[PDB]
Amino acid sequence: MSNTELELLRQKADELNLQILKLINERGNVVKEIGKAKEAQGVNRFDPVRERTMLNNIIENNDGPFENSTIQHIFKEIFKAGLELQ
């Protein structure tokens, strides 16, 4: 592989990193707005049926190179961060 090709692939990866960052943050703003609406609780409510449905739907759309468990784990981390935000 040439040095130019290595740089091109790594620049694509960096651009994708930044786009993922942008979408995670936009999602964060959304989930904060949703949190504003909910009723105050002793611990951050994430309805389990909605969560399990969301995860399974994400998995249904998983045609990428990662196993479904990997995708599920990453999106559980994203979700948890969101909850902390609320």
Author numbering: 1 to 86
Sentences from the paper on this structure:
The first step of the pathway, aldol condensation of phosphoenolpyruvate (PEP) and D-erythrose-4-phosphate (E4P) to 3-deoxy-D-arabino-heptulosonate-7-phosphate (DAHP) is catalyzed by the DAHP synthase enzyme. In B. subtilis, regulation of DAHP synthase is thought to be controlled by its N-terminal domain (BsCM_2), which has residual chorismate mutase activity. Herein, we have reported the crystal structures of the BsCM_2 domain of DAHP synthase from B. subtilis in complex with citrate and chlorogenic acid. A functional trimer has three active sites formed at the interface of two monomers. However, BsCM_2 forms an entirely helical dimeric structure with two active site clefts which are formed by the residue contributions from both monomers, as previously described.
